[PDB]
């Protein structure tokens, strides 16, 4: 089964940096929009950022601009999220969603063409 496996999280002090990776087992990201979704406990899943290979574009949320970077390495079919300047509000579990166009990137995505297991990030003040 085409499965997405995210990793690279952990507990880090505020103001640091981290680098998450999620890879696809069963199919490549050659034709997949990659979108990162964050779920803090006690609230609803919130959009983080999305990257597209078709136009080489990157969309970022209001809190994500100027701190988060999204990159893709199709050679090893993985998607990377490099964040810097951690803040306490960023502590949450993260997933990445792979979808074949379908206009799934309208605000709240809530489509999940390909759902993966997420990784927990803790930010200590």
């Amino acid at each position: 089964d085409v499965q997405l496996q995210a990793s690279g999280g952990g507990s880090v002090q505020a103001g640091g940096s981290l680098r998450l990776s999620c890879a696809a087992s069963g199919h490549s990201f050659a034709n997949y929009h990659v979108a990162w979704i964050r779920q803090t406990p006690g609230k609803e899943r919130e959009f983080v950022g999305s990257a597209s290979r078709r136009d080489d574009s990157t969309y970022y949320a209001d809190f994500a601009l100027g701190r988060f970077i999204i990159s893709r390495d199709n050679d090893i079919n993985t998607a990377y999220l490099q964040m810097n300047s951690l803040k306490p509000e960023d502590s949450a579990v993260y997933y990445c969603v792979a979808a074949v166009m379908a206009q799934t990137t309208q605000g709240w995505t809530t489509d999940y063409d390909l759902r993966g297991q997420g990784t927990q990030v803790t930010v200590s003040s």
Binding site: D55, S57, Y59, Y60
Partner: protein, 53 residues
Amino acid sequence: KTKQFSQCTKKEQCRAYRLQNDKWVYNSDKLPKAAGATLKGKLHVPFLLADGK
């Protein structure tokens, strides 16, 4: 409203449309259709065939 939109760089990434409510059109195949019931009346056709000398 002359509103800009950040995060877009290349203009041909997307387009802009035009909207109108009045000033209907004939059912010509050279145009795309609108959305919803596509019918708000009918008209008469001048120059109809008739007998003559």
